[PDB]
RNA sequence: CGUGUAGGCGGCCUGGGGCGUCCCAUGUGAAAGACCACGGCUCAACCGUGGGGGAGCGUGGGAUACGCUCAGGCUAGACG
RNA sequence: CCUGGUCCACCCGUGACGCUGAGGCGCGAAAGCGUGGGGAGCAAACCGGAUUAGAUACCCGGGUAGUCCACGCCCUAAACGAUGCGCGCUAGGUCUCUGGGUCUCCUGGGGGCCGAAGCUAACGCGUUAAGCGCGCCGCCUGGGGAGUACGGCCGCAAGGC
């Protein structure tokens, strides 16, 4: 068990003679607040069920966010298709400035002091997906020179 | 012992249908065929066994798979002859990654297994007899070897990795060590422990599977003679 | 006809690693060497050596990747994740010592020519100079 | 769609100049405003004092990797 | 007969003499225009015969410019790979054109198909990149208004930029 906050939920739909069937979507984040988080997307015939599946995959796929002072190691940019995200580390006592998507994800990941910018396609879903791969690719002075051994 | 055995009739395979990644593991192209460098096979058979053994002597189970006729039966033996689950028929999908479910069809095999020897058959109309029989038939058909350990194999050994790539993927996504015997028709990189050499002529498949299962039981006790292989072997 | 050989080299490398190749021979040059040296002296490579391909002098430059990996796409990480030329043949970029970039928050390097040898970010900033920002590596 | 004028861009090594480029010193960059501190009006707004900065540009000196220029050589581009 | 580009081979000659390219200049399908030839077939227009509610169409029988040639204009296009040019680098599988070799093989240029990695919004691209980079040119900045108006330049005009 971790935190588990719910990003957004939508009602989609398809066609079929007679009318339109349906489906709901659940994009969800999860994190103790120690440097561990997981994003999960859940589709299901009903609101609650979907929100459930959310957390399930959420916990399934999670990442080691190497914090530091409560901020972040280095500044990075990542593009996920059409949606691009900028993560830039702030000094203690700043705030977590971001949209609902990147902020939510960033809170449970721990961070308290981070500068963020949401460029490109601002597709909620895709921003999330983007935010993760960002963290995923975070390095510390350690694992840095850990590769420049030889 | 090995050099002569393998080189005897257990090296060199697929030709000009290769996969450039697997070149470090090749000597040349005699008469068209890609003949693999066996010398490197050893240094690779080594480490591989170095891993088999370090698992054999710690009692962790291995899922063997071979779904190709030229290498089917010879995996039904070496597996029974080392008490290791295996997959000889159609390697169904999500067996591993969707384990909590396929196991529901094993729990369905023993559902019939125990209603097999029972007084309930006195009844059950002929519509449920031909049925519940058949259902058991195929149930048994594909799950002859996939029952043993109701737990994810700490590894998986396999003939042609590209032939059963599906499986390789499942394991790969589940962080399971993957051992297998790949020819040129197979890409190294996505194999943890690699057995470079023939993958079609029943020769190299029995010679590598044997000493594979021969190194299995050499960390449990029971050093025996080889298992059934020759009956129509060419 | 190669407009800017350096930006070529860098790319030669960038393309090499992408599939994890042993070494790659970029045509030789004292300035390229100078640059290469700082990739080794700072450890983005095993290093480089002079060679020949018919009286024609390239430079064998041996890459350097990370540890193999668990899960799918077991391909290793890389020592050289991102290399891209700053000052370009069509937009020369210069900097006073105070302007000098701070690559990737201390984690990366910014090679750059100068009046007293090809330094790097820390190397110049400490040496107390500036010069043509050559590229950024990390 | 070509051809090509101006222009933009320029392969390998050696040397001279030091034009861009880089550093140091010095003059300049008024005051007011701004920003950091300290006090005056009961606080504040306003307001006084001090400090710290500012690219630019002139001058003197220094450096010579990359760009430029003059000089020498080469053959992987290009031509024959 | 006259003449362009182009590939290969030999490593011989020159010694960076390069790439690109605003404007300029040249070429530029078809239709169209001018003068003069030519005219079988075809065929805008045009005339009938059918169909049809009507049928200024589709189908049928006729048929003139034109389609052809000479010289001169016109300068458009789904002028399409809807993909500017040059150079370096980044798996291979297959068949095909055309060169060269101590020719079951190898290498060089070119035309295709599937595809690593990588790109891509997706479709797809993929050593003939839409990958990874540098140079230089051209171009886009919501739809309609409108490629219209005005001015300008060009053109016999139609019209073009
Ligand atoms: Mg993009
Ligand atoms: Mg010129
Ligand atoms: Mg000077
Ligand atoms: Mg002032
Ligand atoms: Mg000469
Ligand atoms: Mg040109
Ligand atoms: Mg024309
Ligand atoms: Mg015409
Ligand atoms: Mg005429
Ligand atoms: Mg007619
Ligand atoms: Mg007619
Ligand atoms: Mg076409
Ligand atoms: Mg062009
Ligand atoms: Mg070809
Ligand atoms: Mg293709
Ligand atoms: Mg090709
Ligand atoms: Mg408007
Ligand atoms: Mg318009
Ligand atoms: Mg028009
Ligand atoms: Mg007008």
Given C43, C105, C106, which is nearest A148 (Cβ)?
Answer: C43
User: Which 8-state DSSP code applies to residue A91?
Assistant: -
Q: Give residue C124's domain range.
A: 81-138
Which DSSP string do the residues of C60-107 spell out, in sequence order?
Answer: EEE--B----SSSS----BS-S-EEESSBTTB--EE-TTT---TTTTT
Domain count for chain C: 2
CA of C2 to the centre of ligand 2 (A): 17
Same-domain check for residues C73 and C86: no
User: What is the token pair recorded at C120?
Assistant: 């790097």
User: What is the token pair recorded at C40?
Assistant: 């080794």
Resolution (A): 3.0
Homologous superfamily of B92-147: Helix hairpin bin (1.10.287.610)
Q: Which residue has the tokens 């068990």?
A: A1
Q: Give the span between the Cα atoms of C66 and C60, in whole angstroms.
A: 20
Residue C41, Cα to own-chain centre: how many angstroms?
11
Q: Give me the total of CB pairs closer than 8 Å, taking one residue from chain A and one from chain C.
A: 26
User: Which 8-state DSSP code applies to residue A20?
Assistant: E
Residue of C nearest to B174 (CA): C71
Same-domain check for residues C18 and C73: yes
- Helix and strand numbers, DSSP H then E, in chain B: 8, 5
Same-domain check for residues C32 and C46: yes
**First-to-last C-alpha distance (Å) of chain A:** 40
CATH number at residue C103: 3.30.1490.10
Residue range(s) of every CATH 1.10.287.610 domain in chain B: 92-147
Same-domain check for residues C22 and C88: no
Same-domain check for residues C97 and C124: yes
Q: Give the burial class of B59: count Cβ atoms within 10 A of its Cβ; 0-12 exposed, 13-18 middle, 19 or more buried.
A: exposed
Same-domain check for residues C48 and C101: no
Q: Give the span between the Cα atoms of B23 and B38, in whole angstroms.
A: 13
CATH classification for the domain delimited by B4-91+148-234, as one of 3.60.130.10, 3.30.450.20, 3.40.50.10490, 3.40.50.150: 3.40.50.10490
Same-domain check for residues C64 and C22: yes
List gaps in chain A by the residue before each (C–N > 2.5 Å). Answer: none
Q: Do chains A and B touch (3 or more CB pairs under 8 A)?
A: no
- The residue out of C54, C80, C106 marking a domain boundary is C80
Same-domain check for residues C70 and C86: no
Residue range(s) of every CATH 3.40.50.10490 domain in chain B: 4-91+148-234
Same-domain check for residues C52 and C69: yes
Same-domain check for residues C136 and C69: no
Residues 106-135 of C with CB under 7 A from strand E: none
CA distances from C75 to A7, B141, B158, B167 (A): 32, 38, 21, 19
Same-domain check for residues C12 and C74: yes
Distance of B36 CA from E135 C1′ (whole Å) = 47
């Amino acid at each position: 068990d971790f935190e588990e906050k719910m990003i957004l939920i939508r009602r989609t739909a398809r066609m079929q003679a007679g009318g339109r069937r349906f489906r709901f979507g659940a994009l969800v984040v999860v994190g103790d607040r120690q440097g561990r988080v997981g994003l999960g997307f859940g589709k299901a015939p009903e609101v609650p069920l979907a929100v459930q599946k959310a957390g399930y995959y959420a916990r399934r796929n999670m990442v080691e966010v190497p914090l530091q002072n409560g901020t972040i190691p280095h500044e990075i940019e990542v593009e996920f298709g059409a949606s691009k995200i900028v993560l830039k580390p702030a000094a203690p006592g700043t705030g977590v400035i971001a949209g609902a998507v990147p902020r939510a994800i960033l809170e449970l990941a721990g961070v308290t002091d981070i500068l963020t910018k949401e460029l490109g396609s601002r597709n909620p879903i895709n921003i999330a997906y983007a935010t993760m791969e960002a963290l995923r690719q975070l390095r510390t002075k350690a694992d840095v020179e850990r590769l420049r051994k030889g | 012992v090995k050099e002569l055995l393998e080189a005897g009739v257990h090296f060199g395979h697929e030709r000009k249908r290769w996969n450039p990644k697997f070149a470090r593991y090749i000597y040349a192209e005699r008469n068209g065929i890609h003949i693999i460098d066996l010398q490197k096979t050893m240094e690779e058979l080594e480490r591989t066994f170095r891993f088999i053994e370090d698992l054999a002597m710690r009692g962790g189970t291995i899922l063997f798979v071979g779904t190709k006729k030229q290498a089917q039966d010879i995996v039904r033996m070496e597996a029974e002859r080392a008490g290791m689950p295996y997959v000889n028929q159609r390697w169904l999908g999500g067996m591993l990654t969707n384990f909590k479910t396929i196991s529901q069809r094993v729990h369905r095999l023993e559902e019939l297994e125990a209603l097999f020897a029972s007084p309930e058959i006195e009844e059950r109309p002929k519509k449920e007899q031909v049925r519940l029989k058949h259902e058991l038939e195929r149930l048994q058909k594909y799950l002859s070897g996939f029952r043993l350990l109701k737990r994810l194999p700490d590894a998986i050994f396999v003939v042609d990795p590209t032939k059963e790539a599906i499986a390789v993927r499942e394991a790969r996504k589940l962080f399971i060590p993957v051992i297998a015997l790949a020819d040129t028709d197979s890409d190294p990189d996505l194999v943890d422990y690699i057995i470079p050499g023939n993958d079609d002529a029943i020769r190299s498949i029995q010679l590598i599977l044997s000493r594979a299962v021969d190194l299995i039981i050499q960390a449990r006790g029971g050093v025996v003679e080889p298992s059934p292989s020759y009956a129509l072997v060419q | 006809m190669l407009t800017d050989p350096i930006a070529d080299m860098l790319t030669r490398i960038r393309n090499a690693t992408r599939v994890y190749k042993e070494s790659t021979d970029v045509p030789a040059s004292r300035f390229k060497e100078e640059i290469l040296r700082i990739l080794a002296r700072e450890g983005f490579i095993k290093g480089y050596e002079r060679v020949d391909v018919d009286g024609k002098p390239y430079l064998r430059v041996y890459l350097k990747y990370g540890p193999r990996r668990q899960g799918p796409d077991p391909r290793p990480e890389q020592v050289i994740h991102h290399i891209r030329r700053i000052s370009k043949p069509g937009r020369r970029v210069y900097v006073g010592v105070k302007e000098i970039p701070r690559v990737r928050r201390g984690l990366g390097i910014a090679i750059l020519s100068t009046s007293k040898g090809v330094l790097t970010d820390r190397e110049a900033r400490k040496l107390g100079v500036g010069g043509e920002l050559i590229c950024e590596v990390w």
